Design a protein around this ligand. Structure first.
Ligand SMILES: COc1cccc(OC)c1-n1c(NS(=O)(=O)[C@@H](C)[C@H](O)c2ncc(C)cn2)nnc1-c1cccc(C)n1
Ligand SMILES: COc1cccc(OC)c1-n1c(NS(=O)(=O)[C@@H](C)[C@H](O)c2ncc(C)cn2)nnc1-c1cccc(C)n1
Lengths: 298, 61, 226, 339, 234, 297
């Protein structure tokens, strides 16, 4: 049971506006002077901006969906295309973040020692492989989502229909399997790569600047702070989602008595919503922090 | 020293100018006519103004 | 597929030559390059001697798992405007200025002092249009004569505005500031201003610290954070 | 004094010369060529783009058969391409990276390259062992080398960087005859087809005409605002084009010793690097540091099409002897063959 | 000097194996690609194996597709060839050669000095119709050679190499593609051919021109040598 | 058999227009700004108008293949009708403006030079888009879906109930139709005819004198103007013919067989309408340099 279904679309629309404009500005800025810049790591900021924009562009549909108590009169094609966009974009966002992490590492940890390793990973072919893994990772929700009626109450709802694959025995097995397979390569492996790369970066940037200088501490503070804020914002944003998802689809086997079960379902809409923190903020942290972007705005 | 030096440069410089002024010089109309005559006479051979069939260009085909 | 035998062999030769060429280029790519603009026949020569332990003369030394190449253009006797564009990707420019060069005759004009033409040459390269990102290091060399000579004559002979009391520290600070202020693009590049000597083999280490800093900061700008 | 009066005689002679130069001109060349038509609007597309270098490109000379060419670059490499199939026939590693000029012998055996090292290196190509060797090393210049060209397999003319241009013999490194008349450094030079006269372009805004046998300068021409960076000859040995840094190009005539059409535009504000003609001398291709290659008309000062495919500036260009190609090299490592 | 020398020999019963090695002296072995040719007691030549520069492409002949193996050692400057199962039709010298391939290049310049081996007890056929000639000194004489397929190609150049071999020596290269002339060869010989009928004409006959003359083709890869044409002084 | 014939044409024109107009949009976008000129500033808007015109086609194709039953909701069909109309107007206007600028570019400056700069020409095209968008608002406002007579078919139409007076049911319909057709075609067609006729007269007058090679290029030029005017006529004229005939059907009161004719052939003129957009990629890529050298000369 819920109590505030009428508040769910409000934050949705707010996120919609904010993400749309916040990423339109950065996308226009990067398209405006990409040819004069030719930066080594601008392609990843571009892919991140586009991924975010498409992540948020298909939101007001689900907004107006939650308003009228789950009817969704937008057809069968569009819930397929919407769900596919949402999932592909989530995976693409995480992959682009971890790729920027690895590139920053290969740049900083060795200034000229193995710069040769850059000509294979900083290329646009890496973006190609990122996107190609992205689409195929989400194909299952494209093939297994089909709108339909149920509960016989003159309301339509877009759910995922497993009667196609799972037999009368494997409905829960197939579900839990695909969910775990999602969360693992969606969060844990990328987060591990990110954490290890950023740790080695911190070690170098802190051991080299260690010698007492007049203004060294001033830049030291700024760099270490930005690194910490990046890691913690990714963690706080994308942790509750996968936490609650694996928690539900795992504790199904433990049969939590009541209150935990009622709470999980009560609090999931907020978890989905809070996942957009990174979408709304990545404009600032990844563009506004770049002083060239600020010069372009001014 | 320097005075005895600079006079050497002065005389060697001024000497060439007599060899410069003692040169016969034709009118400019003849020169222009000759240039135009060469261009018009050899206009047929140049393969950069008037292209040749794609069988003859080794680069294209 | 219409090629004959000799054509296939010809393209095999080309593939192998290309691979060899790419390898040699990569090998040379990870080796830092420096330029040494003496701005005076007196000061420069000592540094290249201490670091080692016709036209262009190039030296090659190593220190702590990093290979250096230095280029010197001392004797060229030509307009610099024509050949200076060859040195665009150099990581740093090592510059040398003397301290005893003040109160010298200049041997040609006898109306201008040496440090003034040193300052002019400094400006010419610090504000040139190719050298905006490239950093600079100043190796102010012959202090051993400066400590001795400061007491006899003050710095006012070579400078109208006052330099304060005559003590080594204040004069060194003043001569340093006169140079450090000269750069216009104060936001793009930096100067490192060592006070070298004729001894102690630390002069090779100062360069390692400086070039390490410049490479790491340039990468930090190239990727994001800075 | 005796010096003051010498300068007076000098200025008197300077005026006396200009007397006849004005007294000879009756009507401008652009007055005679009113009758002939526009030449067209030539647009020619890139045919082959060949990429192996890893730095800037500073020189390029075509062979004597319009199939083989040689390119010099900043990294110590001097490739010898094959234009038809775009292979790489040879690759020479150098002793000094800093290079500024290449040259290809008219026979086909030798190849030369020299730069800031002050030396000119002659490289043998057809040897029994199978690797390219260094035959001679020519020393004697006090500055950098601007351009070196071949007369035959045994003689070579080098344009220095102090004030001089010298003529060498190859087997004995000694230099035979030295030409010393300029007031500033020399930048380019072109040889006449008869191969008895040659011209040179300095940085005091001048060009001179020499004599390869006698060793004196017969004519000197003026009419620029800044330095000259390129010089070529008309296919007929009676006129030569001159580039500059004041954005203009100019055409001079040796029999008259006047000036002629000035291929200038008001939109152009940058200097030029290279200059060449075509067969029969109807077009004048020039290269600009605005990342362009413009095609003028040697007969009427009007412009024709332009060639733009380069990211960075163009450093050298040259046309063949059969007339079927023109090649241009940029500071971006690429080198392109046009049609 | 370009001196090349081979080693290994002796008699081996059928089924046994031996190995042949060749050592090069000062001509930048790494760039060149080497071959292996043969010669029965009194017969023509034939081509046994090959190996490129870089140990890339390897090609073999038909008779020895499975028994013989070829290899090269870039440092130490040596060439090896190993023959495993030996039949009775391999009693021959073995004559190493060299070859460099580029635009103006002249293949088959140098030729080894040979070894020996006595065991125990599609293709473009080329004719060279005549067997022997009664040639007399001082007069011009010519030699004919032919083929099955037109050796001309779309590139623009044919492929027909003429050779010469005096009694008791190793072959030399005379004219590589028809109408060219090899380094150090006097100016008497001439290419003079087209299509699928090639000839060779010499102006004056010095004594050294006695020997055998072969013609090779080089378009398709199983390389066919002609028979011999002998020039008898009389 | 139209119910089975039409969606094929829709999907074919979809694929063709998408790939083509995409190519030209790509080649104009990938190009740098310094190569862009005014003609480019107009051809870009043409290309985007064409793409947005064709993109909303499959949603219509399935609607026909399902025998007129529209399931995608109340919003999507409003947006799609709006897009299709506004793109129609934007296309005709972009072509007309290109014609006007082309005529201005040749012989106007010698007579007189009075116009707003090209730097303000972007704001000019902005005026074009805005007037276009506001011109087709009633189709966004009176396009509500719904279920007609008790068959299950839902097809979204024009509902003239903002007026909601039975005596006035036809008046607003015929008014909106005639307003659309006049402001859409009668003005741009005539003005295009004039600005092209001036090109004809000036190519006739500037080159009256005999020349060796200029007359043949004049011929290949004068071919282009006539083929272009006639192809625009054939591409956009017929549809308005049948529209006008139907709407004037009120006055003349034709027999029912004529109405059956009008209705049976209405889908075909809409289908054939796209030919302008579909040919624009090729008919631009082929005739670009010819127009450009004609303009420069
Ligand atoms: C993707 O379409 C949706 C449409 C509307 C609402 C949704 O809110 C879950 C999503 N949705 C879904 N559906 S679900 O997994 O099937 C979910 C309904 C499943 O029953 C479930 N799980 C966990 C628990 C504890 C209980 N029950 N999964 N992710 C998103 C999503 C949405 C927007 C943004 C992001 C980043 N994600
Ligand atoms: C806009 O949606 C459509 C969807 C499918 C087919 C259509 O056929 C034209 C259109 N359509 C419409 N329908 S209509 O006006 O409602 C029509 C029902 C009106 O009753 C009418 N008209 C004429 C007669 C004789 C009788 N009755 N009007 N314009 C377009 C259109 C479409 C694409 C491109 C262009 C330039 N135009």
């Amino acid at each position: 049971w819920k109590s505030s279904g009428a508040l769910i679309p409000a934050i949705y629309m707010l996120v919609f506006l904010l993400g749309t404009t916040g990423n339109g500005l950065v996308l226009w800025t990067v398209f405006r002077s990409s040819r004069e810049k030719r930066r080594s790591a601008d392609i990843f900021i571009a892919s991140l901006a586009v991924a975010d924009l498409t992540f948020v562009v298909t939101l007001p549909l689900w907004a107006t969906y939650t308003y009228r108590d789950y009817d969704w009169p937008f057809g069968t094609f569009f819930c397929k295309l919407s769900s596919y966009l949402i999932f592909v974009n989530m995976y693409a966002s995480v992959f682009c973040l971890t790729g920027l992490s690895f590139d920053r590492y290969l740049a900083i940890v060795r200034p000229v020692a193995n710069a040769r390793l850059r000509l294979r990973v900083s290329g646009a072919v890496a973006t190609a492989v990122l996107w190609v893994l992205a689409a195929l990772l989400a194909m299952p929700v494209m093939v297994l989502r089909t709108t339909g009626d149920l509960e016989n109450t003159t309301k339509v709802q877009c759910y995922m229909d497993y009667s196609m694959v799972a037999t009368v025995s494997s409905e829960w097995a197939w579900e839990v399997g695909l969910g775990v397979s999602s969360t693992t390569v969606g969060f844990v492996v990328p987060f591990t790569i990110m954490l290890t790369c950023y740790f080695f970066i911190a070690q170098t940037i802190a051991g080299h600047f260690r010698k007492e200088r007049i203004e060294g501490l001033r830049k030291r503070r700024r760099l270490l702070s930005i690194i910490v804020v990046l890691v913690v914002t990714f963690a706080l944003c994308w942790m509750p989602y996968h936490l609650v998802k694996t928690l539900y689809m795992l504790g199904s086997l433990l049969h939590w008595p009541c209150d935990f079960d009622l709470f999980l379902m009560n609090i999931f809409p907020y978890c989905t919503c809070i996942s957009y923190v990174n979408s709304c903020l990545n404009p600032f942290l990844y563009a506004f922090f770049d002083p060239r972007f600020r010069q372009a705005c001014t | 020293s320097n005075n005895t030096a600079s006079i050497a440069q002065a005389r060697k410089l001024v000497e060439q100018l007599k060899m410069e002024a003692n040169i016969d010089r034709i009118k400019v109309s003849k020169a222009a006519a000759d240039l135009m005559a060469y261009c018009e006479a050899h206009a047929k051979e140049d393969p950069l103004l008037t292209p040749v069939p794609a069988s003859e260009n080794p680069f294209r085909e | 597929c219409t090629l004959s035998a000799e054509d296939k062999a010809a393209v095999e030769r080309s593939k192998m030559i290309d691979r060899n060429l790419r390898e040699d280029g990569e090998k040379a790519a990870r080796e830092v390059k420096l330029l040494l603009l003496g701005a005076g026949e007196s000061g420069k020569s000592t540094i290249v001697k201490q670091m080692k332990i016709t036209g262009i003369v190039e030296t090659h030394f190593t220190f702590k798992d990093l290979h250096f190449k230095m280029f010197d253009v001392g004797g060229q006797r030509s307009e610099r405007k024509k050949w200076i564009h060859c040195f665009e990707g150099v990581t740093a420019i090592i510059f040398c200025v003397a301290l005893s060069d003040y109160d010298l005759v200049l041997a040609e004009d006898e109306e201008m002092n040496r440090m003034h033409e040193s300052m002019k040459l400094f400006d010419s390269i610090c504000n040139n249009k190719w050298f905006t990102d490239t950093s600079i290091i100043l190796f102010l060399n012959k202090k051993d004569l400066f400590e001795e000579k400061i007491k006899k004559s003050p710095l006012t002979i070579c400078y109208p505005e006052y330099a304060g009391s005559n003590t080594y520290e204040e004069a060194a600070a003043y001569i340093q500031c006169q140079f450090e202020d000269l750069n216009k693009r104060k936001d793009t590049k930096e100067i490192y201003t060592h006070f070298t000597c004729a001894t102690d083999t630390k002069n090779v280490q100062f360069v390692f610290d400086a070039v390490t800093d410049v490479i790491i900061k340039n990468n930090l700008k190239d990727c994001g954070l800075f | 004094s005796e010096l003051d009066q010498l300068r007076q005689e000098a200025e008197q002679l300077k005026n006396q010369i200009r007397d006849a130069r004005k007294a000879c001109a009756d009507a401008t060349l652009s007055q005679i060529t009113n009758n002939i038509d526009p030449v067209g609007r030539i647009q020619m597309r890139t045919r082959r783009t060949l990429r192996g270098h890893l730095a800037k490109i500073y020189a390029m000379h075509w062979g004597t058969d319009s199939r083989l060419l040689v390119s010099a670059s900043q990294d110590g490499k001097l490739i010898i391409w094959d234009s038809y199939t775009t292979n790489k026939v040879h690759a020479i590693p150098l002793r000094s990276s800093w290079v500024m000029t290449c040259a290809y012998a008219p026979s086909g055996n030798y190849v030369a390259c020299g730069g800031l090292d002050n030396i000119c290196s002659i490289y043998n190509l057809k040897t029994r062992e199978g690797n390219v060797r260094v035959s001679r090393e020519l020393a004697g210049h006090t500055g950098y080398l601007s351009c070196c060209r071949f007369l035959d397999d045994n003689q070579i003319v080098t344009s220095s960087g102090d004030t001089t241009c010298a003529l060498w013999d190859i087997e004995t490194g000694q230099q035979t005859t030295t030409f010393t008349g300029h007031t500033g450094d020399v930048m380019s030079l072109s040889l006449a087809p008869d191969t008895r006269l040659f011209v040179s372009g300095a940085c005091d805004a001048s060009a001179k005409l020499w004599d390869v046998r006698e060793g004196m300068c017969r004519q000197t021409f003026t009419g620029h605002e800044s330095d000259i960076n390129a010089i070529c000859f008309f296919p007929n040995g009676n006129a030569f084009a001159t580039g500059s840094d004041d954005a203009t190009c100019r055409l001079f005539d040796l029999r008259a010793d006047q000036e002629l059409m000035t291929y200038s535009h008001d939109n152009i504000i940058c200097g030029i690097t290279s200059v060449s003609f075509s067969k029969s001398g109807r077009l004048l291709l020039a290269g600009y540091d605005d990342f362009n290659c413009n095609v003028w008309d040697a007969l009427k000062a009007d412009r024709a099409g332009v060639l733009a495919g380069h990211d960075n500036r163009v450093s050298c260009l040259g046309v063949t002897d059969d007339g079927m190609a023109v090649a241009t090299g940029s500071w971006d490592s690429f080198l392109k063959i046009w049609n | 000097d370009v001196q090349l020398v081979e080693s290994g020999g002796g008699l081996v019963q059928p089924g046994g194996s031996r190995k042949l090695s060749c050592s090069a002296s000062g001509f930048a072995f790494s760039s060149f690609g080497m071959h292996w040719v043969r010669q029965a007691p009194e017969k023509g030549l034939e081509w046994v194996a090959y190996i490129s520069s870089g140990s890339g492409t390897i090609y073999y002949a038909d008779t020895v597709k499975g028994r013989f193996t070829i290899s090269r050692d870039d440092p130490k400057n040596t060439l090896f060839l190993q023959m495993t199962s030996l039949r009775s039709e391999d009693t021959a010298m073995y004559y190493c050669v060299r070859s460099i391939y580029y635009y103006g290049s002249s293949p088959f310049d140098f030729w080894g000095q040979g070894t020996t081996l006595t065991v125990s007890s599609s293709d473009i056929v080329m004719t060279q119709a005549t067997s022997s000639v009664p040639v007399t000194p001082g007069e011009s004489v010519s030699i004919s050679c032919r083929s099955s397929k037109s050796l001309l190609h779309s590139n623009g150049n044919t492929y027909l190499y003429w050779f010469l071999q005096r009694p008791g020596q190793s072959p030399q290269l005379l004219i590589y593609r028809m109408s060219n002339l090899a380094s150090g060869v006097p100016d008497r010989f001439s290419g003079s051919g087209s299509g699928t009928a090639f000839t060779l004409t010499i102006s004056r006959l010095e004594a050294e021109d006695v020997g055998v003359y072969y013609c090779m083709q080089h378009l398709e890869y199983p390389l066919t040598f002609g028979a011999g044409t002998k020039l008898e002084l009389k």
